[PDB]
């Protein structure tokens, strides 16, 4: 999977079956990105787990 881990779409390791988009905690004035790749992601509504390339756009 190649996903936007560093903002740019980068190739995640072969262990990484999922790319995650974590929204963090609802905070205002806080722009922190929690987009990386995961080997075994936990699908929640807080953190979304997609397994398609460039999904975490």
PDB file of N, CA, C and O in Angstrom:
ATOM      1  N   UNK A   1       0.812  -1.209   0.000  1.00  0.00           N
ATOM      2  CA  UNK A   1       0.000   0.000   0.000  1.00  0.00           C
ATOM      3  C   UNK A   1       0.830   1.236   0.000  1.00  0.00           C
ATOM      4  O   UNK A   1       1.828   1.341   0.716  1.00  0.00           O
ATOM      5  N   UNK A   2       0.456   2.148  -0.838  1.00  0.00           N
ATOM      6  CA  UNK A   2       1.025   3.442  -0.832  1.00  0.00           C
ATOM      7  C   UNK A   2      -0.042   4.417  -0.332  1.00  0.00           C
ATOM      8  O   UNK A   2      -1.111   4.542  -0.937  1.00  0.00           O
ATOM      9  N   UNK A   3       0.216   5.059   0.772  1.00  0.00           N
ATOM     10  CA  UNK A   3      -0.755   5.941   1.382  1.00  0.00           C
ATOM     11  C   UNK A   3      -0.095   7.209   1.896  1.00  0.00           C
ATOM     12  O   UNK A   3       1.138   7.279   2.016  1.00  0.00           O
ATOM     13  N   UNK A   4      -0.900   8.213   2.181  1.00  0.00           N
ATOM     14  CA  UNK A   4      -0.413   9.523   2.571  1.00  0.00           C
ATOM     15  C   UNK A   4      -0.036   9.540   4.044  1.00  0.00           C
ATOM     16  O   UNK A   4      -0.781  10.029   4.889  1.00  0.00           O
ATOM     17  N   UNK A   5       1.084   8.939   4.345  1.00  0.00           N
ATOM     18  CA  UNK A   5       1.584   8.870   5.702  1.00  0.00           C
ATOM     19  C   UNK A   5       2.273  10.174   6.077  1.00  0.00           C
ATOM     20  O   UNK A   5       2.120  10.680   7.172  1.00  0.00           O
ATOM     21  N   UNK A   6       3.018  10.714   5.148  1.00  0.00           N
ATOM     22  CA  UNK A   6       3.772  11.942   5.387  1.00  0.00           C
ATOM     23  C   UNK A   6       3.110  13.102   4.669  1.00  0.00           C
ATOM     24  O   UNK A   6       3.728  14.117   4.392  1.00  0.00           O
ATOM     25  N   UNK A   7       1.847  12.922   4.345  1.00  0.00           N
ATOM     26  CA  UNK A   7       1.106  13.913   3.588  1.00  0.00           C
ATOM     27  C   UNK A   7       1.196  13.596   2.127  1.00  0.00           C
ATOM     28  O   UNK A   7       0.237  13.736   1.379  1.00  0.00           O
ATOM     29  N   UNK A   8       2.363  13.166   1.734  1.00  0.00           N
ATOM     30  CA  UNK A   8       2.614  12.678   0.413  1.00  0.00           C
ATOM     31  C   UNK A   8       2.375  11.172   0.437  1.00  0.00           C
ATOM     32  O   UNK A   8       2.535  10.525   1.504  1.00  0.00           O
ATOM     33  N   UNK A   9       1.963  10.618  -0.674  1.00  0.00           N
ATOM     34  CA  UNK A   9       1.716   9.202  -0.751  1.00  0.00           C
ATOM     35  C   UNK A   9       3.030   8.414  -0.812  1.00  0.00           C
ATOM     36  O   UNK A   9       3.799   8.510  -1.776  1.00  0.00           O
ATOM     37  N   UNK A  10       3.279   7.677   0.244  1.00  0.00           N
ATOM     38  CA  UNK A  10       4.501   6.927   0.434  1.00  0.00           C
ATOM     39  C   UNK A  10       4.194   5.456   0.554  1.00  0.00           C
ATOM     40  O   UNK A  10       3.077   5.075   0.940  1.00  0.00           O
ATOM     41  N   UNK A  11       5.133   4.642   0.191  1.00  0.00           N
ATOM     42  CA  UNK A  11       4.956   3.228   0.253  1.00  0.00           C
ATOM     43  C   UNK A  11       5.134   2.726   1.700  1.00  0.00           C
ATOM     44  O   UNK A  11       6.212   2.853   2.287  1.00  0.00           O
ATOM     45  N   UNK A  12       4.081   2.190   2.259  1.00  0.00           N
ATOM     46  CA  UNK A  12       4.100   1.621   3.585  1.00  0.00           C
ATOM     47  C   UNK A  12       4.702   0.218   3.508  1.00  0.00           C
ATOM     48  O   UNK A  12       4.766  -0.362   2.411  1.00  0.00           O
ATOM     49  N   UNK A  13       5.214  -0.307   4.614  1.00  0.00           N
ATOM     50  CA  UNK A  13       5.917  -1.600   4.589  1.00  0.00           C
ATOM     51  C   UNK A  13       4.952  -2.738   4.231  1.00  0.00           C
ATOM     52  O   UNK A  13       3.740  -2.580   4.337  1.00  0.00           O
ATOM     53  N   UNK A  14       5.492  -3.875   3.836  1.00  0.00           N
ATOM     54  CA  UNK A  14       4.691  -5.048   3.417  1.00  0.00           C
ATOM     55  C   UNK A  14       3.832  -5.624   4.550  1.00  0.00           C
ATOM     56  O   UNK A  14       2.960  -6.444   4.316  1.00  0.00           O
ATOM     57  N   UNK A  15       4.090  -5.191   5.767  1.00  0.00           N
ATOM     58  CA  UNK A  15       3.304  -5.613   6.927  1.00  0.00           C
ATOM     59  C   UNK A  15       2.020  -4.829   6.972  1.00  0.00           C
ATOM     60  O   UNK A  15       1.034  -5.244   7.571  1.00  0.00           O
ATOM     61  N   UNK A  16       2.041  -3.704   6.316  1.00  0.00           N
ATOM     62  CA  UNK A  16       0.971  -2.756   6.350  1.00  0.00           C
ATOM     63  C   UNK A  16      -0.094  -3.045   5.336  1.00  0.00           C
ATOM     64  O   UNK A  16       0.057  -2.788   4.148  1.00  0.00           O
ATOM     65  N   UNK A  17      -1.155  -3.621   5.830  1.00  0.00           N
ATOM     66  CA  UNK A  17      -2.280  -4.038   5.030  1.00  0.00           C
ATOM     67  C   UNK A  17      -3.334  -2.968   4.992  1.00  0.00           C
ATOM     68  O   UNK A  17      -4.203  -2.967   4.116  1.00  0.00           O
ATOM     69  N   UNK A  18      -3.260  -2.059   5.936  1.00  0.00           N
ATOM     70  CA  UNK A  18      -4.244  -1.023   6.065  1.00  0.00           C
ATOM     71  C   UNK A  18      -3.558   0.312   6.217  1.00  0.00           C
ATOM     72  O   UNK A  18      -2.445   0.392   6.738  1.00  0.00           O
ATOM     73  N   UNK A  19      -4.204   1.321   5.778  1.00  0.00           N
ATOM     74  CA  UNK A  19      -3.777   2.663   5.977  1.00  0.00           C
ATOM     75  C   UNK A  19      -4.809   3.274   6.896  1.00  0.00           C
ATOM     76  O   UNK A  19      -6.010   2.996   6.744  1.00  0.00           O
ATOM     77  N   UNK A  20      -4.400   4.041   7.859  1.00  0.00           N
ATOM     78  CA  UNK A  20      -5.356   4.547   8.794  1.00  0.00           C
ATOM     79  C   UNK A  20      -5.467   6.041   8.748  1.00  0.00           C
ATOM     80  O   UNK A  20      -4.497   6.757   8.444  1.00  0.00           O
ATOM     81  N   UNK A  21      -6.645   6.486   9.019  1.00  0.00           N
ATOM     82  CA  UNK A  21      -6.966   7.858   9.125  1.00  0.00           C
ATOM     83  C   UNK A  21      -7.590   8.060  10.485  1.00  0.00           C
ATOM     84  O   UNK A  21      -8.748   7.704  10.708  1.00  0.00           O
ATOM     85  N   UNK A  22      -6.829   8.576  11.392  1.00  0.00           N
ATOM     86  CA  UNK A  22      -7.322   8.813  12.705  1.00  0.00           C
ATOM     87  C   UNK A  22      -7.605  10.276  12.816  1.00  0.00           C
ATOM     88  O   UNK A  22      -6.775  11.105  12.448  1.00  0.00           O
ATOM     89  N   UNK A  23      -8.766  10.597  13.275  1.00  0.00           N
ATOM     90  CA  UNK A  23      -9.185  11.967  13.386  1.00  0.00           C
ATOM     91  C   UNK A  23      -8.659  12.599  14.684  1.00  0.00           C
ATOM     92  O   UNK A  23      -8.686  13.832  14.870  1.00  0.00           O
ATOM     93  N   UNK A  24      -8.146  11.754  15.547  1.00  0.00           N
ATOM     94  CA  UNK A  24      -7.609  12.182  16.802  1.00  0.00           C
ATOM     95  C   UNK A  24      -8.708  12.327  17.800  1.00  0.00           C
ATOM     96  O   UNK A  24      -9.552  11.452  17.922  1.00  0.00           O
ATOM     97  N   UNK A  25      -8.702  13.393  18.510  1.00  0.00           N
ATOM     98  CA  UNK A  25      -9.770  13.711  19.407  1.00  0.00           C
ATOM     99  C   UNK A  25     -10.345  14.998  18.897  1.00  0.00           C
ATOM    100  O   UNK A  25      -9.598  15.778  18.285  1.00  0.00           O
ATOM    101  N   UNK A  26     -11.645  15.245  19.054  1.00  0.00           N
ATOM    102  CA  UNK A  26     -12.231  16.486  18.583  1.00  0.00           C
ATOM    103  C   UNK A  26     -11.671  17.686  19.348  1.00  0.00           C
ATOM    104  O   UNK A  26     -11.972  17.900  20.520  1.00  0.00           O
ATOM    105  N   UNK A  27     -10.802  18.396  18.693  1.00  0.00           N
ATOM    106  CA  UNK A  27     -10.207  19.589  19.205  1.00  0.00           C
ATOM    107  C   UNK A  27     -10.257  20.643  18.151  1.00  0.00           C
ATOM    108  O   UNK A  27     -10.112  20.342  16.959  1.00  0.00           O
ATOM    109  N   UNK A  28     -10.465  21.848  18.557  1.00  0.00           N
ATOM    110  CA  UNK A  28     -10.472  22.953  17.649  1.00  0.00           C
ATOM    111  C   UNK A  28      -9.129  23.639  17.722  1.00  0.00           C
ATOM    112  O   UNK A  28      -8.464  23.563  18.768  1.00  0.00           O
ATOM    113  N   UNK A  29      -8.705  24.237  16.607  1.00  0.00           N
ATOM    114  CA  UNK A  29      -7.436  25.003  16.494  1.00  0.00           C
ATOM    115  C   UNK A  29      -6.227  24.051  16.545  1.00  0.00           C
ATOM    116  O   UNK A  29      -5.074  24.470  16.663  1.00  0.00           O
ATOM    117  N   UNK A  30      -6.499  22.774  16.407  1.00  0.00           N
ATOM    118  CA  UNK A  30      -5.469  21.775  16.445  1.00  0.00           C
ATOM    119  C   UNK A  30      -5.446  21.015  15.139  1.00  0.00           C
ATOM    120  O   UNK A  30      -6.350  20.218  14.856  1.00  0.00           O
ATOM    121  N   UNK A  31      -4.452  21.270  14.343  1.00  0.00           N
ATOM    122  CA  UNK A  31      -4.305  20.597  13.088  1.00  0.00           C
ATOM    123  C   UNK A  31      -3.176  19.576  13.212  1.00  0.00           C
ATOM    124  O   UNK A  31      -1.993  19.918  13.050  1.00  0.00           O
ATOM    125  N   UNK A  32      -3.519  18.379  13.622  1.00  0.00           N
ATOM    126  CA  UNK A  32      -2.575  17.285  13.696  1.00  0.00           C
ATOM    127  C   UNK A  32      -3.062  16.148  12.849  1.00  0.00           C
ATOM    128  O   UNK A  32      -4.228  15.767  12.932  1.00  0.00           O
ATOM    129  N   UNK A  33      -2.212  15.645  12.017  1.00  0.00           N
ATOM    130  CA  UNK A  33      -2.554  14.552  11.155  1.00  0.00           C
ATOM    131  C   UNK A  33      -2.139  13.223  11.745  1.00  0.00           C
ATOM    132  O   UNK A  33      -1.001  13.045  12.205  1.00  0.00           O
ATOM    133  N   UNK A  34      -3.078  12.314  11.770  1.00  0.00           N
ATOM    134  CA  UNK A  34      -2.841  10.971  12.197  1.00  0.00           C
ATOM    135  C   UNK A  34      -3.172  10.033  11.061  1.00  0.00           C
ATOM    136  O   UNK A  34      -4.200   9.353  11.065  1.00  0.00           O
ATOM    137  N   UNK A  35      -2.363  10.087  10.039  1.00  0.00           N
ATOM    138  CA  UNK A  35      -2.521   9.235   8.897  1.00  0.00           C
ATOM    139  C   UNK A  35      -1.260   8.442   8.690  1.00  0.00           C
ATOM    140  O   UNK A  35      -0.199   8.998   8.407  1.00  0.00           O
ATOM    141  N   UNK A  36      -1.363   7.174   8.872  1.00  0.00           N
ATOM    142  CA  UNK A  36      -0.245   6.306   8.689  1.00  0.00           C
ATOM    143  C   UNK A  36      -0.699   5.002   8.132  1.00  0.00           C
ATOM    144  O   UNK A  36      -1.801   4.914   7.591  1.00  0.00           O
ATOM    145  N   UNK A  37       0.087   3.997   8.289  1.00  0.00           N
ATOM    146  CA  UNK A  37      -0.273   2.690   7.837  1.00  0.00           C
ATOM    147  C   UNK A  37      -0.160   1.712   8.977  1.00  0.00           C
ATOM    148  O   UNK A  37       0.650   1.895   9.880  1.00  0.00           O
ATOM    149  N   UNK A  38      -0.979   0.712   8.958  1.00  0.00           N
ATOM    150  CA  UNK A  38      -1.062  -0.227  10.024  1.00  0.00           C
ATOM    151  C   UNK A  38      -1.075  -1.650   9.484  1.00  0.00           C
ATOM    152  O   UNK A  38      -1.541  -1.909   8.361  1.00  0.00           O
ATOM    153  N   UNK A  39      -0.527  -2.550  10.252  1.00  0.00           N
ATOM    154  CA  UNK A  39      -0.487  -3.932   9.909  1.00  0.00           C
ATOM    155  C   UNK A  39      -1.831  -4.578  10.263  1.00  0.00           C
ATOM    156  O   UNK A  39      -2.382  -5.359   9.490  1.00  0.00           O
ATOM    157  N   UNK A  40      -2.367  -4.194  11.388  1.00  0.00           N
ATOM    158  CA  UNK A  40      -3.638  -4.658  11.839  1.00  0.00           C
ATOM    159  C   UNK A  40      -4.385  -3.491  12.462  1.00  0.00           C
ATOM    160  O   UNK A  40      -4.156  -3.119  13.621  1.00  0.00           O
ATOM    161  N   UNK A  41      -5.227  -2.891  11.681  1.00  0.00           N
ATOM    162  CA  UNK A  41      -5.903  -1.683  12.074  1.00  0.00           C
ATOM    163  C   UNK A  41      -7.243  -2.028  12.723  1.00  0.00           C
ATOM    164  O   UNK A  41      -7.798  -3.101  12.472  1.00  0.00           O
ATOM    165  N   UNK A  42      -7.723  -1.162  13.575  1.00  0.00           N
ATOM    166  CA  UNK A  42      -8.981  -1.347  14.239  1.00  0.00           C
ATOM    167  C   UNK A  42      -9.960  -0.338  13.696  1.00  0.00           C
ATOM    168  O   UNK A  42      -9.821   0.878  13.927  1.00  0.00           O
ATOM    169  N   UNK A  43     -10.900  -0.824  12.953  1.00  0.00           N
ATOM    170  CA  UNK A  43     -11.900   0.005  12.314  1.00  0.00           C
ATOM    171  C   UNK A  43     -12.867   0.589  13.316  1.00  0.00           C
ATOM    172  O   UNK A  43     -13.679  -0.129  13.912  1.00  0.00           O
ATOM    173  N   UNK A  44     -12.757   1.855  13.524  1.00  0.00           N
ATOM    174  CA  UNK A  44     -13.661   2.571  14.375  1.00  0.00           C
ATOM    175  C   UNK A  44     -14.197   3.749  13.576  1.00  0.00           C
ATOM    176  O   UNK A  44     -14.021   3.792  12.348  1.00  0.00           O
ATOM    177  N   UNK A  45     -14.881   4.663  14.209  1.00  0.00           N
ATOM    178  CA  UNK A  45     -15.310   5.840  13.517  1.00  0.00           C
ATOM    179  C   UNK A  45     -14.309   6.954  13.822  1.00  0.00           C
ATOM    180  O   UNK A  45     -14.251   7.982  13.146  1.00  0.00           O
ATOM    181  N   UNK A  46     -13.517   6.722  14.844  1.00  0.00           N
ATOM    182  CA  UNK A  46     -12.501   7.660  15.278  1.00  0.00           C
ATOM    183  C   UNK A  46     -11.292   7.519  14.374  1.00  0.00           C
ATOM    184  O   UNK A  46     -10.689   8.515  13.927  1.00  0.00           O
ATOM    185  N   UNK A  47     -10.964   6.287  14.099  1.00  0.00           N
ATOM    186  CA  UNK A  47      -9.881   5.927  13.236  1.00  0.00           C
ATOM    187  C   UNK A  47     -10.407   5.022  12.166  1.00  0.00           C
ATOM    188  O   UNK A  47     -10.924   3.930  12.454  1.00  0.00           O
ATOM    189  N   UNK A  48     -10.295   5.459  10.960  1.00  0.00           N
ATOM    190  CA  UNK A  48     -10.773   4.704   9.849  1.00  0.00           C
ATOM    191  C   UNK A  48      -9.637   3.921   9.265  1.00  0.00           C
ATOM    192  O   UNK A  48      -8.495   4.388   9.248  1.00  0.00           O
ATOM    193  N   UNK A  49      -9.935   2.765   8.799  1.00  0.00           N
ATOM    194  CA  UNK A  49      -8.938   1.900   8.239  1.00  0.00           C
ATOM    195  C   UNK A  49      -9.326   1.542   6.828  1.00  0.00           C
ATOM    196  O   UNK A  49     -10.361   0.915   6.591  1.00  0.00           O
ATOM    197  N   UNK A  50      -8.534   1.946   5.905  1.00  0.00           N
ATOM    198  CA  UNK A  50      -8.770   1.653   4.531  1.00  0.00           C
ATOM    199  C   UNK A  50      -7.625   0.794   4.011  1.00  0.00           C
ATOM    200  O   UNK A  50      -6.517   0.881   4.509  1.00  0.00           O
ATOM    201  N   UNK A  51      -7.899  -0.058   3.072  1.00  0.00           N
ATOM    202  CA  UNK A  51      -6.905  -0.977   2.573  1.00  0.00           C
ATOM    203  C   UNK A  51      -6.638  -0.750   1.083  1.00  0.00           C
ATOM    204  O   UNK A  51      -6.129  -1.627   0.376  1.00  0.00           O
ATOM    205  N   UNK A  52      -6.946   0.429   0.612  1.00  0.00           N
ATOM    206  CA  UNK A  52      -6.765   0.745  -0.779  1.00  0.00           C
ATOM    207  C   UNK A  52      -5.726   1.859  -0.909  1.00  0.00           C
ATOM    208  O   UNK A  52      -5.616   2.726  -0.038  1.00  0.00           O
ATOM    209  N   UNK A  53      -4.982   1.835  -1.978  1.00  0.00           N
ATOM    210  CA  UNK A  53      -3.895   2.785  -2.165  1.00  0.00           C
ATOM    211  C   UNK A  53      -4.433   4.181  -2.285  1.00  0.00           C
ATOM    212  O   UNK A  53      -5.494   4.402  -2.894  1.00  0.00           O
ATOM    213  N   UNK A  54      -3.733   5.109  -1.641  1.00  0.00           N
ATOM    214  CA  UNK A  54      -4.062   6.520  -1.646  1.00  0.00           C
ATOM    215  C   UNK A  54      -5.434   6.805  -1.001  1.00  0.00           C
ATOM    216  O   UNK A  54      -6.012   7.872  -1.218  1.00  0.00           O
ATOM    217  N   UNK A  55      -5.940   5.869  -0.191  1.00  0.00           N
ATOM    218  CA  UNK A  55      -7.252   6.035   0.442  1.00  0.00           C
ATOM    219  C   UNK A  55      -7.277   7.172   1.473  1.00  0.00           C
ATOM    220  O   UNK A  55      -8.275   7.893   1.595  1.00  0.00           O
ATOM    221  N   UNK A  56      -6.181   7.355   2.190  1.00  0.00           N
ATOM    222  CA  UNK A  56      -6.118   8.357   3.254  1.00  0.00           C
ATOM    223  C   UNK A  56      -5.705   9.736   2.708  1.00  0.00           C
ATOM    224  O   UNK A  56      -4.721  10.353   3.125  1.00  0.00           O
ATOM    225  N   UNK A  57      -6.469  10.184   1.754  1.00  0.00           N
ATOM    226  CA  UNK A  57      -6.267  11.446   1.098  1.00  0.00           C
ATOM    227  C   UNK A  57      -6.968  12.563   1.865  1.00  0.00           C
ATOM    228  O   UNK A  57      -8.205  12.606   1.872  1.00  0.00           O
TER     229      UNK A  57
END
